[PDB]
Design a protein around this ligand. Structure first.
Ligand SMILES: Cc1ncc(C[n+]2csc(CCOP(=O)(O)OP(=O)(O)O)c2C)c(N)n1
Ligand SMILES: Cc1ncc(C[n+]2csc(CCOP(=O)(O)OP(=O)(O)O)c2C)c(N)n1
Ligand SMILES: Cc1ncc(C[n+]2csc(CCOP(=O)(O)OP(=O)(O)O)c2C)c(N)n1
Ligand SMILES: [Mg+2]
Ligand SMILES: [Mg+2]
Ligand SMILES: [Mg+2]
Lengths: 553, 553, 553
């Protein structure tokens, strides 16, 4: 005789999950008991939103399934921002929630009576309420299959208190394996051929990676394909870390710096989009990054994304990882590829030029320029580090130093653009980075850090050595800029935050707190915090007036 | 200057659509005007349900996109049953609906004020309301891409009266092409290898086809793969017609007759499921058709379906058509395949034995046995015929004669099990069959025909030579059987239909009407109607008491 | 030991329901068995849509709860149009639906796996799935209270097959009474005073009744209020029959004929709206019926409706029935009311003038004018007759003769404006009219009758003596008019219906069939059918070209 909670955890074990992120409630205590018995850690936070964002972080930074665990009612409703974020970001999280007992349904009782499945339906791949304890294993496994397959996304499994506490005889119900191929589907040989023929006869070809390249992590395949063709590779934020293993001469970097190419007479001839959607990060349908004049080969698992905002030449529905593999295989059997050395140097030179351009207009005459601050962070970024970015102006500036470095992970806002998401995200990422030997750095704004500032307590309780760097410009920055730029100099309201010692908050939570206002003071602080196996907060006084290039766009 | 309706039709044209199925309304009259101008026929019915099912029938029988067109309000709400059916049936239909003008939203006006998108969300791949006339082309095309890619399914595009009537200058908005590869994704080489290895070392292997094999229609690939391996092939209803081109010795027929295999000591060793889900048609998780002892290779575009009710050996998420192609390609390069002649003969003999078994207990001592009736239909079934089946007992009987024939199409109930769906389905099918030179026969129940009996008018108006065969047992038959069988002999209520001359109704609508009660009278009637390029109704008096084998299950 | 189906029926009994309207299915057979045992008739139709509309008709014509009963899957989806119609019409129907068993949820099984509750949520007052058999009584009763209270509306109760078949010991679960006051809430005395003060100092005051006056049927109170004040009373379609008991001199008739009042210098001074919403029937916010210059007193149970499209003077949220009562009570204690005889005559004269105006332009030079046809129906309309109206042009013409007669019921399209709804509606109404001794006449279009033409069978099987009058103009009339009027003379497509003997269809179903083409032939036919306790169809050949005054609007 065992509980439905046991059933959940036994299935999670068989799926290979090793960590869950949650906040306790009576409704879901059978899952806690089971995890205690099985030595499965639940990283318990101070807010369900932080718990959900940790699950995302864990998934995004480890390329794993993330699992979030929340109680009925407010437990679920506090998880909604994570679910929506993961939905837009194509990130694989199983959200497990409690709900009211099915017996005594519709009795106006504690934490019951909200349609949690209806609320999640618009923003999950699947959302469903379990009706019987016996169904737990097959439904947990089905939810996980939905989460993990292309395009990845969140799933909500709602488990009534009733269903969880009820006891059945183990050995009346079978726990299935996760039987799902790890290699995705790949293009038809004729599409691959055509794609390769177009790639071969292009003068200025370019590859753009998006989130699905990251989720599948086919690093050795990518790098064989890139080495054979010499075609320079860009990424949106989520795909960036997939460039870390490529040879320098073909790291184009973040797609944004594709911006100035047209006016340099170097607008790409052809673009191979591998899970990079037409939208915010790729410049919508504007043709400012992905030129209207270019032939586009788009590979996405969702047919809707294929040429959504712009005409394309070849539309392939397939898995991105499977496709990368296929390109490598076809390309190992090839080796008649034109040089592209000149084109690669041009790509390199343009990225380099934007950087030096920015550098030529940055200061400290009584105050630290956000670009200078980002540079200080940049010199510590390599494959042994995951960078998590939050807070508008902060990350638009940070982005300019991200292309020339090679992070193990880079986790920035997706389409949701939700301020505050970073803290939970970074905490989940650090958990995943512990097995891989990486340090997680969170770079956030003074506004954004306030959303989840209580997580400092969690960092100390759980001994997670996350470094939280706050770019402190005394304001909701991008948003203050909008008011001045779009309305007028004296139209600034509700956008100032001229109060609060954030390092003191961290100190009062047990975390090491630093405050800095200079290139040299910040440098020393970050170095000292990296040297300690200890969580930290670095409160960086930074100038507000400078406008990052990406903002004017 | 052109209308939003023009924009819709121009985009449909470029997608290659050649017929729409609808019922007129003022709200959507711009689409009618445009179709009139471009010579695009709209097949207008007597009920939006019939229109919607016609779109299904056209898609299912032509392996094409089907397009339904309904007005705001009741237009949409009448279309809901077709949407749900297509959803469960993985059938590609674009449902185009009017809705209230966005200007004067929330003014309690005619046909406005129901959230049509919210209603369709639970049963569509995508459902969305267009907000601007300029968006019409990219959104129509996006909707079509979603409909057509794996697994196929319905899509609802809601077009406000406002948005449709409003005029823009053509040449300010571009009409995209349909750029979407026609070949689906295929398995990773290593998964294919493993699948083929398991297939090669099996003793009693079996292939089971489901709806996706049918949507992709890779007939020449399938038959090359079957010819190379000699592996017998079964299908659920929707997959059946895909067996019409295979050599007889490997036509297992409908999956149901896999039922008696276990007790004959011939339970399959291995089963290759190509788009056949675990569910109603495959015997759920019971192992009565797909044995628990068998190794299962499942190929489905939705990872959810992979081993949903039962353990599997290999779970591949890929397109079924692309998979079939890949198996043919790998299998042309092979030709070292074990005989399977004995096994195929065994498959053959079991199917044949079930048939003769049924035949040995069927009569006419004053009344025509439903099996004998089905046989009369069978002798007219070949590649030049699409059979559409409705009505419970009718189709459970019909199913027993469908395995030994080779129809160009077989369209039966799917998971929805919705009585009455057949009439509109057969009407759409007949439209698709006209270019292919086929005849459509509908075989339906006296109950089910009453759902859409007015479509006889549409047959006559539109000169569609459909033959409507009514198995008339004076009742909602299966449903009456349930009452006697599950409750008791004198517990029959609301299930009798002892009234109504259905051939008369057809005659009053201008269609040729026949009434028959015998093997010989029915035979003559069907032959005569097949000989005429004319729609017909054949009212067949048939016995009620007999229980089809499938019913006891 | 008893079934959940028993529980449903026992609770329905205690609520006082005496008829259900449904179509049988195995999933809901426990309800059929129970009704058979308790002598509760289920009127079984040929389409769930018809069943649902019958429930509406029964409720709308009897001022009762209507109860509809449909099976899982297609049974529910076919009911959707009735649900939506009842939603916009504020009509009290309990929709009881089957759904798949909760055990074996998510097994891809027959008729399961569509989120029926999600589909109904956007168009019900409450929609809910029952989780335990013990909950059936309290939940049925809850559903009924929701349906019956102000503003009335449809409710969906979803009862899994599981839940219905499962057996419990009766006497372990109590069946509650319907304990819900029959008298609605009434306005605060101060609001009533103010309303009465404004009404007393008005020069040209007017009352407009809507659906909620009809649901509560406070006939004796209304007529005491009207007799005390001498204030003329109008109604939208649904409120019309509430005018049948009032003195002639204060019967303004349908609100539409308030149209010409402004240009006659007689635009109302003040309007007391009793459940009449701003919307389609009251001319939206246009002030063509409810003048912008008038002081408006609006009484509605939904605060949202209060001045939704137009400024009002006094907004009261209360029940319309309770309010009418309160006005009668306050007004019995009053009797100092200004004359209004002149104003009433003026109202009378305007209505009369519109009628004579129309009459002066109607013909038969080879063809029967729709107006003349309506007049033939009018001479049989009194308190002993319920009129049901369908089909666009048909009812816009019929409406012009409705003001001067006094029907026991008038059931016309509401906001949904869904063609075809009439047939089931009239069938339900005739069931309700049987206890009250009334005859039901359906007046419908040739288009609309096609939607549910099979119900002629149901009329014969159930011996319901409905008379179905088809205004046959060989077309979807209003819709063809729109094309000529809005697009052009030769822009007529998919709007013609030049085929089909509708009377023949009725005769083939066992109903008396007539066809007529003249004032005198129609007159004889209608009289003969009224004389027989028998269902009938009168196919009326009617001219198409005439444009009803309401159409130009
Ligand atoms: C949850 C959420 N709240 C508000 C906003 C709107 N918003 C866009 S930028 C911004 C704030 C910037 O704050 P900060 O973290 O201080 O970063 P800075 O721009 O100062 O670097 C706000 C409020 C949002 N996108 N998401
Ligand atoms: C829309 C719908 N209504 C009701 C049912 C329940 N049902 C199962 S079998 C059956 C009807 C069979 O009647 P008929 O069309 O005459 O075929 P028969 O079995 O009588 O040959 C019904 C009504 C359903 N599955 N779908
Ligand atoms: C279900 C539905 N279908 C279509 C329309 C659009 N429409 C406006 S009136 C009308 C048809 C008129 O029907 P009929 O019964 O022939 O009316 P008449 O010819 O008497 O005007 C249609 C189709 C609608 N409002 N609802
Ligand atoms: Mg800031
Ligand atoms: Mg039957
Ligand atoms: Mg008509």
């Amino acid at each position: 005789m065992i509980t439905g909670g046991e059933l959940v955890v036994r299935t999670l074990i068989k799926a290979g999950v090793e960590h869950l992120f949650g906040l306790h409630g009576a409704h879901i205590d059978t899952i806690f008991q089971a995890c205690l018995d099985h030595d499965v850690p639940i990283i318990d936070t101070r807010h369900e939103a932080a718990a959900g964002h940790a699950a995302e972080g864990y998934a995004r930074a480890g390329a794993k399934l993330g699992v979030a665990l929340v109680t009925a009612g407010g437990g679920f409703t506090n998880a909604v921002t994570p679910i929506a974020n993961a939905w837009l970001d194509r990130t694989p999280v199983l959200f497990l929630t409690g709900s009211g007992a099915l017996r005594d349904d519709e009795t106006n009782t504690l934490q019951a009576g909200i349609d949690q499945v209806a609320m999640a339906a618009p923003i999950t791949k699947w959302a469903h309420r379990v009706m019987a304890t016996e169904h737990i294993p097959r439904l947990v496994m089905q939810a996980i299959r939905a989460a993990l397959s292309a395009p990845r996304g969140p799933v909500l499994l709602d488990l009534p208190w009733d269903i969880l506490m009820n006891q059945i005889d183990e050995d009346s119900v079978i726990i299935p394996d996760l039987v799902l191929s790890a290699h995705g589907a790949r293009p038809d040989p004729a599409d691959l051929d055509q794609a390769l023929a177009l790639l071969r006869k292009a003068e200025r070809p370019v590859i753009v990676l998006g989130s699905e390249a990251s989720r599948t992590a086919r690093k050795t395949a990518l790098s064989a394909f890139v080495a054979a063709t010499g075609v320079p590779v860009f990424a949106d934020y989520e795909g960036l870390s997939m460039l870390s293993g490529l040879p320098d001469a073909m790291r184009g970097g973040l797609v944004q710096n594709l911006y100035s190419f047209a006016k340099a007479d170097a607008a790409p001839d052809l673009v191979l989009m591998l899970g990079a959607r037409f939208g915010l990060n790729t410049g919508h349908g504007s043709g400012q990054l992905i030129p209207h004049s270019a032939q586009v080969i788009q590979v996405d698992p969702d047919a809707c994304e294929l040429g959504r905002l712009q005409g394309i030449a070849l539309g392939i529905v397939a898995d991105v990882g499977g496709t990368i593999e296929a390109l490598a295989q076809a390309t190992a059997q090839d080796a008649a590829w034109p040089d592209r050395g000149d084109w690669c140097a041009k790509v390199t030179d343009l990225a380099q030029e934007r950087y030096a351009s920015i550098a030529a207009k940055s200061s400290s005459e009584h105050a630290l320029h956000p670009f200078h601050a980002s540079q200080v962070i940049a010199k510590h970024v390599d494959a042994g580090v995951t960078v998590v970015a939050d807070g508008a102006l902060t990350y638009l500036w940070l982005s300019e130093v991200m292309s020339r470095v090679k992070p193990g992970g880079f986790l920035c806002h997706g389409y949701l653009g939700s301020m505050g998401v970073g803290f939970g995200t970074a905490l989940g990422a650090q958990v995943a980075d512990l097995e891989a030997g990486r340090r997680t750095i969170l770079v956030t704004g003074d506004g954004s850090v306030g959303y989840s500032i209580g997580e400092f307590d969690t960092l100390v309780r759980k001994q997670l050595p996350l470094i939280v760097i706050i770019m402190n410009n005394q304001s909701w920055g991008a948003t203050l800029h909008f008011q001045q730029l779009a309305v007028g100099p004296n139209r600034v309201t509700g956008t100032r935050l001229e109060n609060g010692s954030y390092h003191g908050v961290a100190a009062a939570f047990g975390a090491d707190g630093y405050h800095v206002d200079s290139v040299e003071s910040f440098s020393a602080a970050l170095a000292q915090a990296l040297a300690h196996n200890r969580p930290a907060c670095i409160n960086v006084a930074v100038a507000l007036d400078p406008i990052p290039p990406e903002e004017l766009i």
